[PDB]
């Protein structure tokens, strides 16, 4: 993130794997 | 009696895309080149008349049938097809309206313009042209031809993306005779294939800026997976050389999912995680790559492949074969220290390509990388950090009984500069010696570090008087590998002097070693610690005031790592006191 | 051979690599290595030869050069030349093989392949450092090399047991240009405390036709004149 298509889908694969909704993970990473 | 021609072109056509579809090894060659026997006899039966206008379009259909199954067979263009497009080009000429191919098709696009119905053809022939100027890093007056295609008034317009763009193909390619590809699916492998060739380049020359733009622009439209792989590659290589490190592993891994060999981007990843520090994950990777290289269609058509350059060593994509790599390995595995696994590692290079007389030539490190006995020391050096020192005679045997022959006879020691001795010799007996050391045995260690200074003193070896056979270019003959060998001998035959107790004699070698390389300083600092345990005073600071008076180009690994070996930690400590 | 008139026609079924544009080519155990026309580069390629009673195939081309010194009635030719202890071809003696090929060729026992073309250069590849691919490109500056310039070209390349006193471990080398520029050479290990290179460039007669090796340095050759002999013994 502190580096664009690409950077959904890193974000599809972490979501893939905690079984977490992309969107809070998106949030949650933009805020911090 | 075109009918028939063209009933024979359109046959042929139909054979050569049978063989491109279905077949085995042979029999798809086979059908091809009896295809292109064909397209050969019907071009020599057309150019046999002086031609008509509507002979043309048909014989222009066979020239591009057969130049393309030239050029797709051979895997590779060449000057033929050029003469062979002049010839057509002449023809298109003597039958309405000389000197070269640039003015011809100059020419020949004026009498285009007086609109002949066979454009579609003509803009085919000028997708292969290309091709071959593509092929042949003839890229200026490929923009002058696409230029005069196009409005002339883009001639500012140097960059060949945009250009290539703008050219159009002319028709959706009616009714005409068969082509085995059309003008389109050409423009496409022209695209990819320039940004891919200007991407690279740019990689190389220091601007992975420019080249991201070019680069995504092959991905962008018709790019081969084996093609996305290497571009993709190039795109870690950019991001890593920029300082950006995580979407270049994004690209990696992307590259490795959709490559079946991705040998290349491993290298890729070695060299991330050693610009970062990350030496296990380094190492890691280059392990994995190692099994990877153990495991290994053309289309009659025009692919992106036949157009792309083998590559050169600069690039990201040069990956050696098992043999070249696990040599990296045990460098790599080396310089670190992990003496222990390098043992190991540089064991089995050795295993392969020795034992090769069975399976698969297995080769040795190319010779921009080192020559075959340079590496059996690099062995022995990790064989002595490891503590094997009964293998690293096995080793230092296994050499000078191969190479009995290339040594000299050393009579010249008899006789008692001009006799030729090559460094690989003169080291072979300063490692036998070190072996010996960690064994604890006085006196044939200074007997082999005596011997190794015999064959670097009554011989030389910068002897290309006669170039006699294949040789070492670099690692065997730099004068810095010359001094750094004797500095060395003297200290490791010094250090025995001080252990039989005979000062006066070590203090002999270690004065003769600064006398030999002053910017070497395990050399000052043996010869101090000898000073200050005896007699310290005038001497010592004599030296001292020269080291601050004196403040690596390329010594060889094998010899480095012994350096690297025998210094002591607590050195600039004694050159501060 | 024993393939079950008196004439038969091939079946282009037996057909392997046509390559087409291969003038020239060689045998070693289960390895193949052709030497292959193109434009001006002629190349050498060498390809993998099945070991197993198979459908006798090619395999993966392992190795490909470009004779880059090389820029074109007389074909060119290639010989086979193996070291000591390890065939179609020529075993050398350590002593020579050491001396011609250097310390590589020796220590990885590696046979090596000898060009002669029709400019006279007589050029050798060490076959284990030729593996390559796509990405492996064979540099040929580096990778093959050029013994001696006959000045006409080359007809015929061998091997002698000079000093008799199946697998001879010969002790000579032996080229020959058209018009007769014989070329032989041999060790010498003298006058610097040093092996050194002992080179001959004869002159026979003629044109030289074509020439064989026979038992004791005896190199059997032919003029447009007669059938003639040269002893090195
Ligand atoms: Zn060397």
Known sequence: LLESSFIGSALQDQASRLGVPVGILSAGMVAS | ?577 | LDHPSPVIPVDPDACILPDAALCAFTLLDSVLVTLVQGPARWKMQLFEQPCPGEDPRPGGQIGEVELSSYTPHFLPVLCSVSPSGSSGGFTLEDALFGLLFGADATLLQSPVVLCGLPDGQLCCVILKALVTSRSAPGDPNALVKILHHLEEPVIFIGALKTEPQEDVHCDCLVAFGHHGRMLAIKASWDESGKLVPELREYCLPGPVLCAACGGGGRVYHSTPSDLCVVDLS
């Open chain 2, 1 to 577: 009696c075109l009918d028939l021609w063209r009933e024979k072109n359109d046959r042929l056509v139909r054979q050569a895309k049978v063989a491109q579809n279905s077949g085995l090894t042979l029999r798809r060659q086979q059908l091809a080149q009896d295809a292109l026997e064909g397209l050969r006899g019907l071009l020599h039966s057309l150019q046999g008349l002086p031609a008509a206008v509507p002979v043309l379009p048909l014989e222009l259909t066979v020239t591009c049938n057969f130049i393309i199954l030239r050029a797709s067979l051979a895997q590779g263009f060449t000057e033929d097809q050029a003469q062979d497009i002049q010839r057509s080009l002449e023809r298109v000429l003597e039958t309405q309206e000389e000197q070269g191919l640039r003015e011809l098709w100059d020419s020949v696009l004026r009498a285009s313009c007086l609109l002949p119905e066979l454009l579609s053809a003509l803009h085919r022939l000028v997708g292969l042209q290309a091709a071959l100027w593509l092929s042949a890093d003839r890229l200026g007056d490929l923009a002058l031809l696409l230029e005069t295609l196009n409005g002339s008034q883009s001639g500012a317009s140097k960059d060949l993306l945009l250009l290539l763009k703008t050219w159009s193909p002319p028709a959706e390619e009616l009714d005409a005779p068969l082509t085995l590809q059309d003008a389109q699916g050409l423009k496409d492998v022209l695209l990819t294939a320039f940004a891919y060739r200007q991407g690279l380049q740019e990689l190389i020359t220091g601007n992975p800026d420019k080249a991201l733009s070019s680069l995504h622009e092959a991905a962008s439209g018709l790019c081969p997976r084996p093609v996305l792989v290497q571009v993709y590659t190039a795109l870690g290589s950019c991001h890593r050389k920029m300082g950006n490190p995580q979407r270049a592993l994004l690209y990696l891994v992307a590259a490795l999912k959709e490559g079946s060999a991705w040998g290349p981007p491993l290298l890729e990843a070695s060299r991330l995680y050693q610009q970062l520090g990350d030496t296990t994950a380094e190492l890691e990777s280059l392990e994995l790559l190692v099994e990877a290289l153990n495991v290994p269609a053309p289309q009659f058509l025009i692919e992106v492949e036949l157009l792309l350059p083998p590559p050169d060593l600069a690039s990201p994509l040069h990956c050696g074969t098992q043999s070249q790599t696990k040599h990296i390995l045990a460098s790599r595995c080396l310089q670190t220290g992990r003496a222990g696994d390098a043992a190991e590692h540089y064991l089995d290079l050795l295993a392969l390509l020795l034992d090769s007389s069975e399976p698969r030539f297995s080769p040795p490190p190319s010779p921009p990388g080192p020559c075959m006995p340079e590496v059996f020391l690099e062995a022995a050096v990790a064989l002595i950090q490891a503590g094997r020192a009964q293998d690293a005679l096995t080793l230092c045997e296994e050499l000078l009984s191969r190479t009995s022959s290339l040594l000299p006879k050393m009579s010249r020691l008899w006789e008692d500069e001009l006799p030729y001795c090559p460094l690989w010799v003169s080291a072979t007996h300063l490692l036998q010696g070190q072996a010996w050391v960690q064994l604890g045995a006085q006196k044939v260690a200074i007997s082999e570090f005596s011997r190794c200074l015999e064959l670097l003193f009554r011989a030389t070896p910068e002897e290309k008087e006669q170039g006699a056979a294949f040789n070492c270019e670099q690692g065997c003959k730099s004068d810095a590998a010359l001094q750094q060998l004797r500095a060395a001998a003297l200290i490791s035959r010094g250090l025995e002097w001080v252990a039989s107790g005979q000062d006066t004699k070590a203090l002999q070698d270690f004065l003769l070693s600064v006398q030999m390389c002053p910017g070497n300083r395990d050399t000052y600092f043996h010869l101090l610690q000898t000073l200050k345990r005896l007699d310290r005073r005038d001497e010592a600071t004599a030296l001292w005031w020269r080291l601050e008076a004196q403040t690596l180009w390329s010594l060889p690994l094998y010899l480095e790592s012994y350096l690297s070996w025998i210094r002591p930690s607590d050195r600039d400590a004694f050159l501060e006191e």
